[PDB]
Amino acid sequence: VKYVDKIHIGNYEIDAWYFSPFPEDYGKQPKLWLCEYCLKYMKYEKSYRFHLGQCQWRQPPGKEIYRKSNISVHEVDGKDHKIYCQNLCLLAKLFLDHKTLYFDVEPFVFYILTEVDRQGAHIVGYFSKEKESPDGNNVSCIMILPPYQRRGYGRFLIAFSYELSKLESTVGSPEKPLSDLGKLSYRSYWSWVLLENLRDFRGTLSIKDLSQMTSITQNDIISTLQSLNMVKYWKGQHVICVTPKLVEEHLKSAQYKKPPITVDSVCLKWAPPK
Ligand SMILES: O=C(NNS(=O)(=O)c1ccccc1F)c1cc(F)cc(-c2ccccn2)c1
Ligand SMILES: [Mg+2]
Ligand SMILES: [Zn+2]
């Protein structure tokens, strides 16, 4: 009843954070070996090395809905690529506590973030999304592989998820409960997006205005402004209350000085030209 506790994927060895229900015989091995392109999981270095020489995948399946320079996103329908998405969900569960869904991947669309070189498109992370979210969740689960965490890739995927919400003419919010790292990442993302808009629009924006500009829900906006102490309350209404000294002294922290990977909406292929 040994669990999977270590994986080898690409040129990375990664320790597990949580139990993932790989078949029992796969957990018995010291490490489990993942093809970084098709996400097939294997029990031995020799089966892994043989697969690397045979596997012709060099990128995620599905449609490449984003490509700028060597940063790429693939949209993968869980129904059209069931095995690939199950493998993805088992991999993700090694690093996600709350994720309970691994094999019934059909209700979901998966957005795979990759980093490309001459060899292929190397998986960095993903977020899943319900094709029909009754709550209004524009992200179900989001996971960045540990060697890529805290390096801007999670920020890119969060920004990407709100770009999709904009093109759908809707607001959206990540599904709860958030992971520990997702909660910090969303709070940091919401802060920068809201603080940048208030700096560049003179604050002449309501909470509803910000919600339409960013596809962030009014609730997530309000709780973020509350954390920034930038909202007044008047007769049941939340009112933005902000000055330049407030905006700048919150913006000029070290948090908002790493240059992001940036979602260039020009390179997002949402609708075909015909
Ligand atoms: O890698 C991430 N965060 N660091 S970040 O990209 O540089 C960044 C900077 C500023 C603002 C936001 C932001 F994401 C990241 C983001 C998430 F949503 C989830 C996970 C995650 C959680 C659980 C397991 C694996 N992965 C990791
Ligand atoms: Mg590790
Ligand atoms: Zn493969």
Residue 224: CATH number of its domain: 1.10.10.10
Among 23, 40, 57, the domain-final residue is 57
Q: Residue 189: how many CB atoms within 10 A of its CB?
A: 22
Q: Which residues of 245-273 are buried (b: 16+ CB within 10 A; e: fewer)?
A: ebbeebbeeeeeeeeebebeeeebeeeee
Catalytic residue among 132, 168, 175, 249: 175
Residues within 5 Å of ion ligand 2, judged at the Cβ atom? 14-15
* Residue found under tokens 């592989």: 145
Contact present, 131 and 108 (Cβ < 8 Å):
yes
Report d(CA 90, CA 96) in Å as an integer.
10
Amino acid at 201: F
The reported resolution of this PDB entry, expressed in Å, is 2.1
Torsion of CA 165, 221, 133, 65, to 10 degrees: 30
Show the tokens assigned to 251.
């913006």
C-beta of 153 in contact with ligand 1 (< 6 A): yes
**Is 42 exposed, middle or buried, given 0-12, 13-18 or 19+ CB atoms closer than 10 A?**
buried
245 domain-assigned: yes
Q: Residue 36: how many CB atoms within 10 A of its CB?
A: 22
Length of the chain equals 274
Report d(CA 108, CA 235) in Å as an integer.
41
Q: Whose CA is nearest to atom 21 of ligand 1?
A: 143
Contact present, 267 and 73 (Cβ < 8 Å):
no
User: With helix as H, strand as E and coil as C, how does the chain read?
Assistant: CCCCCEEEECCEEEECCCCCCCCHHHHCCCCEEECCCCCCEECCHHHHHHHHHHCCCCCCCCEEEEEECCEEEEEEECCCCHHHHHHHHHHHHCCCCCCCCCCCCCCEEEEEEEEECCCCEEEEEEEEEECCCCCCEEECCEEECHHHCCCCHHHHHHHHHHHHHHHCCCCEEECCCCCHHHHHHHHHHHHHHHHHHHHHCCCCCCHHHHHHHHCECHHHHHHHHHHHCCEEEECCEEEECCCHHHHHHHHCCHHHHCCCCCCCHHHECCCCCC
Q: Longest Cα pair distance anywhere in the chain, in angstroms?
A: 69
Residue partners of 114: CB distance under 8 A and separation at least 6 = 59, 60, 71, 72, 73, 74, 121, 122, 123, 124
Contact present, 82 and 105 (Cβ < 8 Å):
yes
201 domain-assigned: yes
Show the tokens assigned to 63.
């449609």
Contact present, 119 and 91 (Cβ < 8 Å):
no
Q: Pairing relation of β-strands 71-77 and 63-68? A: antiparallel
153 domain-assigned: no
Contact present, 171 and 215 (Cβ < 8 Å):
yes
Q: Could you confirm whether 175 is annotated as catalytic? A: yes
Report the separation in Å between the CA atom of 35 and the middle of ligand 3, taken as the mean of its atom positions.
5
C-beta of 174 in contact with ligand 1 (< 6 A): no
Nearest ligand to the CA of 55 is: 3
Which ligand 1 atom is at minimum distance from the Cα of 174? 18
Report the separation in Å between the CA atom of 51 and the middle of ligand 3, taken as the mean of its atom positions.
6
159 domain-assigned: no
Report d(CA 139, CA 175) in Å as an integer.
6
| CA neighbours closer than 13 Å in the CB half-sphere of residue 39 | 23
The domain of 233 spans 180-256
4 domain-assigned: yes
How many structural domains compose the chain?
Answer: 2
264 domain-assigned: no
* Torsion sign over Cα 249, 154, 141, 45: negative
Show the tokens assigned to 255.
């948090």
- Method of determination? X-ray
Report d(CA 249, CA 238) in Å as an integer.
22
Which of 90, 108, 119, 116 is CA-nearest to residue 16?
A: 90
